[PDB]
Amino acid sequence: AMLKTLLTSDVIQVVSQAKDWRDAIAISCQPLIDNGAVEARYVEAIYRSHEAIGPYYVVGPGIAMPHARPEDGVNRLSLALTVITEGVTFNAEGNDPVKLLIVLAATDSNSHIEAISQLAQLFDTASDVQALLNAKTPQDILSVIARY
Amino acid sequence: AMLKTLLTSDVIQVVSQAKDWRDAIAISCQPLIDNGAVEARYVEAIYRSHEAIGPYYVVGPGIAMPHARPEDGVNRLSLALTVITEGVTFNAEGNDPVKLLIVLAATDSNSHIEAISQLAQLFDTASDVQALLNAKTPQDILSVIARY
């Protein structure tokens, strides 16, 4: 019942255009820095991994799950969700452009596993992914997430 | 069928004891070092995370899921399963003693999510968790895994 609880309006973004992948990630993480769920260094860990290792957190066509380790500055279980209606390139091969970002932050494996289990179901539900990839407002998103 | 495919005879172990948590981690990861799925340093990465923030990868009473990042030495999606029949202290508060270790290694988030989604189902099946905690031989483990 987790996604519905975690993904409230305050951590849901719809923006038309991101400057680039870094802006897309920042947009998504700023509410979690602001509410104390993650330290600012968490986003930095994400950027540094992207730059050094590559966009392996892009999980399928149009969908990214930016995240880093519990030790990289997570304070509590938290998610954020952004839709970039124009799409943004992550140089993730055929998965570009990315239009949906769901940031994950967990402090431990029990909570990680539960959150991932739910996200796996969401990402495997094409009509819900379609509704999110095509979302224009936070309500579009909240309506999907209401079923989780 | 991921679990039944990946968790074959060559990557499952029952031992009576380990020296301490570090040695339990070592035993549990060794098959994946041996077969090249991970680098030896993947074990050192797990130790350093535990040193930084504690046993975050202990999932619940009796159960650990040691892992680290792709960049910490993963070559190919892999699992290994160890039962340490006398248990081991991970300094995991009420979750100790740990008896079941499932090591996870993934190179990207698509495969990580798939593996976690399957492990979540195992961990959410109390009858199968108990069967693994009770396991005395490799045949006992395969009989559980045969349902995945």
Short mmCIF file of C-alpha atoms in Angstrom, two decimals:
data_model
loop_
_atom_site.label_atom_id
_atom_site.label_comp_id
_atom_site.label_asym_id
_atom_site.label_seq_id
_atom_site.Cartn_x
_atom_site.Cartn_y
_atom_site.Cartn_z
CA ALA A 1 0.00 0.00 0.00
CA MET A 2 3.29 1.66 -0.05
CA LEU A 3 3.42 3.74 -3.22
CA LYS A 4 0.22 5.57 -2.39
CA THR A 5 1.63 6.57 0.99
CA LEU A 6 5.07 7.57 -0.25
CA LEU A 7 4.15 9.36 -3.50
CA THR A 8 2.02 12.24 -2.30
CA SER A 9 1.61 15.51 -4.17
CA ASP A 10 4.59 17.16 -2.55
CA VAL A 11 7.06 14.71 -4.21
CA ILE A 12 5.34 14.60 -7.63
CA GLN A 13 6.65 16.89 -10.45
CA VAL A 14 5.42 17.42 -14.05
CA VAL A 15 7.62 19.77 -15.99
CA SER A 16 7.69 20.38 -19.64
CA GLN A 17 11.43 20.55 -20.27
CA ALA A 18 14.54 19.59 -18.55
CA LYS A 19 17.80 21.08 -19.59
CA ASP A 20 19.49 17.69 -19.47
CA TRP A 21 19.68 14.46 -17.43
CA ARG A 22 21.22 16.25 -14.43
CA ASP A 23 18.33 18.73 -14.31
CA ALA A 24 15.84 15.87 -14.60
CA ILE A 25 17.40 14.12 -11.64
CA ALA A 26 17.64 17.36 -9.63
CA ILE A 27 14.02 18.21 -10.22
CA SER A 28 13.06 14.87 -8.87
CA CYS A 29 15.28 14.92 -5.82
CA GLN A 30 14.86 18.48 -4.61
CA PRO A 31 11.65 17.72 -2.62
CA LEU A 32 13.46 14.87 -0.79
CA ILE A 33 16.40 17.09 0.08
CA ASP A 34 14.00 19.80 1.22
CA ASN A 35 11.90 17.53 3.44
CA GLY A 36 14.94 15.86 4.96
CA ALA A 37 14.31 12.42 3.50
CA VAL A 38 17.76 12.44 1.88
CA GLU A 39 20.88 14.53 2.34
CA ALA A 40 22.04 16.62 -0.59
CA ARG A 41 25.03 14.34 -1.01
CA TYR A 42 22.60 11.57 -2.13
CA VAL A 43 21.95 13.39 -5.38
CA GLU A 44 25.65 13.97 -5.80
CA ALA A 45 26.24 10.20 -5.48
CA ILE A 46 23.70 9.69 -8.26
CA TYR A 47 25.40 12.21 -10.52
CA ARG A 48 28.87 10.79 -9.83
CA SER A 49 27.73 7.24 -10.67
CA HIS A 50 26.04 8.42 -13.85
CA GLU A 51 29.19 10.18 -14.97
CA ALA A 52 31.65 7.44 -14.04
CA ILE A 53 29.62 4.27 -14.58
CA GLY A 54 26.73 5.24 -16.91
CA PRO A 55 22.89 5.32 -16.85
CA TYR A 56 22.38 1.74 -15.63
CA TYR A 57 19.45 2.95 -13.51
CA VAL A 58 17.39 3.50 -16.70
CA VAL A 59 15.20 0.42 -16.45
CA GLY A 60 13.18 0.32 -19.62
CA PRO A 61 11.78 2.41 -22.43
CA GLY A 62 11.21 5.88 -21.11
CA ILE A 63 11.75 4.98 -17.45
CA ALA A 64 14.57 5.84 -15.04
CA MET A 65 14.89 4.89 -11.35
CA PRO A 66 17.62 7.17 -9.99
CA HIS A 67 18.98 5.92 -6.66
CA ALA A 68 22.16 5.39 -4.69
CA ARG A 69 23.12 3.45 -1.56
CA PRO A 70 21.64 3.74 1.95
CA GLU A 71 25.09 5.01 3.02
CA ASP A 72 25.03 7.77 0.38
CA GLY A 73 22.76 9.96 2.54
CA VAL A 74 19.33 8.36 2.93
CA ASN A 75 17.51 9.39 6.12
CA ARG A 76 14.16 7.58 5.58
CA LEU A 77 12.27 5.52 3.04
CA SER A 78 11.15 7.90 0.35
CA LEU A 79 10.19 8.13 -3.32
CA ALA A 80 9.73 11.02 -5.75
CA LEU A 81 8.20 10.95 -9.21
CA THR A 82 8.76 13.34 -12.13
CA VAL A 83 7.35 13.34 -15.63
CA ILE A 84 9.20 15.32 -18.29
CA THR A 85 6.66 15.78 -20.94
CA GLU A 86 9.21 16.73 -23.66
CA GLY A 87 11.56 13.65 -22.74
CA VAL A 88 15.24 13.88 -21.81
CA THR A 89 18.20 11.90 -23.18
CA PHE A 90 20.24 9.92 -20.66
CA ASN A 91 22.40 8.21 -23.36
CA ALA A 92 20.69 5.00 -22.33
CA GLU A 93 20.66 3.55 -25.85
CA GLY A 94 17.15 2.49 -27.01
CA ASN A 95 15.55 3.38 -23.66
CA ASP A 96 15.83 7.08 -24.50
CA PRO A 97 14.18 9.46 -24.31
CA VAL A 98 13.37 9.19 -20.59
CA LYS A 99 10.02 10.65 -19.59
CA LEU A 100 9.34 9.08 -16.19
CA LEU A 101 11.71 9.24 -13.25
CA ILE A 102 11.00 7.56 -9.94
CA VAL A 103 13.69 8.28 -7.36
CA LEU A 104 14.12 5.63 -4.71
CA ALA A 105 15.76 6.12 -1.34
CA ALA A 106 15.85 3.41 1.31
CA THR A 107 17.88 2.93 4.47
CA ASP A 108 17.83 -0.87 4.55
CA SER A 109 17.02 -3.96 2.54
CA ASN A 110 13.60 -4.80 3.99
CA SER A 111 12.22 -1.45 2.83
CA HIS A 112 14.17 -1.53 -0.41
CA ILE A 113 12.77 -4.93 -1.31
CA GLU A 114 9.19 -3.87 -0.54
CA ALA A 115 9.47 -0.63 -2.55
CA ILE A 116 11.11 -2.39 -5.50
CA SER A 117 8.52 -5.16 -5.47
CA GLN A 118 5.78 -2.51 -5.92
CA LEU A 119 7.70 -0.53 -8.50
CA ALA A 120 8.29 -3.75 -10.50
CA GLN A 121 4.55 -4.23 -10.68
CA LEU A 122 3.98 -0.63 -11.75
CA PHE A 123 6.68 -0.80 -14.46
CA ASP A 124 5.13 -4.06 -15.69
CA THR A 125 1.66 -2.47 -16.07
CA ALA A 126 1.75 -0.84 -19.51
CA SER A 127 -1.50 1.09 -19.12
CA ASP A 128 -0.27 2.70 -15.90
CA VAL A 129 3.14 3.41 -17.41
CA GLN A 130 1.41 4.90 -20.47
CA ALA A 131 -0.76 7.11 -18.26
CA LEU A 132 2.35 8.29 -16.38
CA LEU A 133 4.63 8.68 -19.50
CA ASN A 134 1.78 10.81 -20.91
CA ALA A 135 0.98 12.67 -17.69
CA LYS A 136 0.41 16.47 -17.86
CA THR A 137 -0.54 17.19 -14.26
CA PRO A 138 0.18 15.85 -10.74
CA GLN A 139 -3.45 14.56 -10.67
CA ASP A 140 -2.82 12.36 -13.71
CA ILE A 141 -0.05 10.79 -11.63
CA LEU A 142 -1.98 10.69 -8.34
CA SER A 143 -4.82 8.84 -10.14
CA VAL A 144 -2.44 6.07 -11.21
CA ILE A 145 -0.66 5.87 -7.88
CA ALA A 146 -4.08 5.65 -6.09
CA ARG A 147 -4.19 2.01 -7.27
CA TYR A 148 -0.94 1.23 -5.45
CA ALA B 1 11.81 -19.13 -13.14
CA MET B 2 14.85 -16.98 -12.24
CA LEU B 3 15.51 -18.46 -8.85
CA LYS B 4 15.27 -22.07 -10.03
CA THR B 5 17.51 -21.25 -12.99
CA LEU B 6 20.18 -19.41 -11.06
CA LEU B 7 20.26 -21.28 -7.76
CA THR B 8 21.73 -24.59 -8.88
CA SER B 9 23.99 -27.02 -7.08
CA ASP B 10 27.15 -25.10 -7.78
CA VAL B 11 26.06 -21.89 -5.96
CA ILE B 12 24.25 -23.31 -2.88
CA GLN B 13 26.08 -24.32 0.41
CA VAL B 14 25.19 -25.56 3.88
CA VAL B 15 27.86 -25.13 6.53
CA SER B 16 27.61 -25.47 10.31
CA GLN B 17 29.49 -22.28 11.33
CA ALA B 18 31.47 -19.22 10.32
CA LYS B 19 34.13 -17.32 12.34
CA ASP B 20 31.97 -14.10 12.47
CA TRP B 21 29.81 -12.04 10.09
CA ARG B 22 32.76 -11.23 7.84
CA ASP B 23 33.56 -14.85 7.40
CA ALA B 24 29.86 -15.62 6.78
CA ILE B 25 29.85 -12.98 4.01
CA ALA B 26 33.04 -14.56 2.57
CA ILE B 27 31.61 -18.09 2.53
CA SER B 28 28.36 -16.86 1.03
CA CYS B 29 30.02 -14.95 -1.82
CA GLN B 30 32.83 -17.41 -2.64
CA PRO B 31 30.92 -19.35 -5.34
CA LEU B 32 30.38 -16.13 -7.26
CA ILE B 33 34.06 -15.23 -7.03
CA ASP B 34 34.97 -18.74 -8.14
CA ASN B 35 32.76 -18.68 -11.20
CA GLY B 36 33.69 -15.13 -12.22
CA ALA B 37 30.27 -13.62 -11.67
CA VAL B 38 31.81 -11.13 -9.26
CA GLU B 39 35.32 -9.92 -8.45
CA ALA B 40 36.89 -10.77 -5.09
CA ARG B 41 36.62 -7.12 -4.07
CA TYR B 42 32.80 -7.37 -4.07
CA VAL B 43 33.21 -8.95 -0.59
CA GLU B 44 35.40 -6.09 0.59
CA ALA B 45 32.73 -3.62 -0.64
CA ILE B 46 30.10 -5.40 1.47
CA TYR B 47 32.42 -5.21 4.50
CA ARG B 48 32.95 -1.46 4.00
CA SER B 49 29.21 -0.74 3.73
CA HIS B 50 28.61 -2.63 6.98
CA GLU B 51 31.49 -0.73 8.57
CA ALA B 52 29.93 2.57 7.43
CA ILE B 53 26.31 2.06 8.44
CA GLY B 54 25.79 -1.40 9.93
CA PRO B 55 24.06 -4.50 8.61
CA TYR B 56 21.51 -2.71 6.47
CA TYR B 57 21.27 -5.82 4.22
CA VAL B 58 19.87 -7.99 7.00
CA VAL B 59 16.25 -8.25 5.89
CA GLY B 60 14.52 -9.67 8.98
CA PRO B 61 14.91 -12.37 11.60
CA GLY B 62 17.41 -14.92 10.35
CA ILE B 63 17.81 -13.50 6.84
CA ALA B 64 20.50 -11.53 5.04
CA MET B 65 20.79 -10.41 1.43
CA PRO B 66 24.38 -9.24 1.01
CA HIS B 67 25.02 -7.15 -2.08
CA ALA B 68 26.82 -4.05 -3.34
CA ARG B 69 26.80 -1.85 -6.42
CA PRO B 70 27.54 -2.98 -10.00
CA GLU B 71 30.76 -0.90 -9.80
CA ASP B 72 31.86 -2.77 -6.68
CA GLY B 73 32.80 -5.78 -8.82
CA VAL B 74 29.78 -7.35 -10.57
CA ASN B 75 30.40 -9.10 -13.88
CA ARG B 76 27.06 -10.90 -14.39
CA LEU B 77 23.63 -11.20 -12.79
CA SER B 78 24.05 -13.84 -10.12
CA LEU B 79 22.71 -15.32 -6.85
CA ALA B 80 24.18 -17.62 -4.29
CA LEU B 81 22.43 -19.16 -1.28
CA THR B 82 24.08 -20.26 1.97
CA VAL B 83 22.61 -21.68 5.12
CA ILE B 84 24.85 -21.49 8.24
CA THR B 85 23.10 -23.89 10.55
CA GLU B 86 24.45 -22.64 13.91
CA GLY B 87 23.77 -18.99 12.92
CA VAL B 88 25.96 -15.97 12.99
CA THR B 89 25.72 -12.61 14.72
CA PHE B 90 25.61 -9.66 12.30
CA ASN B 91 25.01 -7.10 15.08
CA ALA B 92 21.57 -6.66 13.54
CA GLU B 93 19.67 -6.07 16.75
CA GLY B 94 16.60 -8.28 17.00
CA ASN B 95 17.19 -9.83 13.55
CA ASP B 96 20.12 -11.91 14.80
CA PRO B 97 21.00 -14.70 14.59
CA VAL B 98 21.32 -14.81 10.75
CA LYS B 99 21.10 -18.29 9.20
CA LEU B 100 20.13 -17.68 5.57
CA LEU B 101 22.21 -15.59 3.23
CA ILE B 102 21.19 -14.92 -0.37
CA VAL B 103 23.90 -12.96 -2.13
CA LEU B 104 22.66 -10.81 -5.01
CA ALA B 105 24.84 -9.33 -7.73
CA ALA B 106 23.46 -7.35 -10.69
CA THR B 107 25.03 -5.09 -13.34
CA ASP B 108 22.03 -2.81 -13.94
CA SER B 109 18.69 -1.81 -12.52
CA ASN B 110 16.46 -3.80 -14.90
CA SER B 111 18.06 -7.04 -13.72
CA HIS B 112 18.26 -5.89 -10.10
CA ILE B 113 14.52 -5.14 -10.07
CA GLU B 114 13.67 -8.49 -11.62
CA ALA B 115 15.80 -10.39 -9.13
CA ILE B 116 14.45 -8.42 -6.15
CA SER B 117 10.90 -8.98 -7.32
CA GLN B 118 11.51 -12.76 -7.26
CA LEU B 119 13.32 -12.71 -3.94
CA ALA B 120 10.51 -10.62 -2.47
CA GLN B 121 8.09 -13.39 -3.29
CA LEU B 122 10.30 -15.99 -1.60
CA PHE B 123 10.75 -13.83 1.45
CA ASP B 124 6.98 -13.24 1.55
CA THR B 125 6.29 -17.01 1.69
CA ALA B 126 6.72 -17.97 5.33
CA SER B 127 6.47 -21.72 4.59
CA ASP B 128 9.46 -21.49 2.22
CA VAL B 129 11.47 -19.19 4.48
CA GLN B 130 11.06 -21.70 7.31
CA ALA B 131 12.08 -24.57 5.02
CA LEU B 132 15.33 -22.70 4.20
CA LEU B 133 16.02 -21.75 7.83
CA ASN B 134 15.53 -25.50 8.70
CA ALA B 135 17.69 -26.68 5.76
CA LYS B 136 20.35 -29.22 6.58
CA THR B 137 21.50 -30.26 3.08
CA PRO B 138 21.69 -28.88 -0.45
CA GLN B 139 18.80 -31.09 -1.47
CA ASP B 140 16.64 -29.35 1.18
CA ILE B 141 17.46 -25.99 -0.46
CA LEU B 142 16.73 -27.15 -3.99
CA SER B 143 13.35 -28.46 -2.94
CA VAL B 144 12.34 -24.97 -1.86
CA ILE B 145 13.90 -23.26 -4.87
CA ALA B 146 12.02 -25.70 -7.16
CA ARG B 147 8.90 -23.66 -6.38
CA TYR B 148 10.45 -20.51 -7.89
#
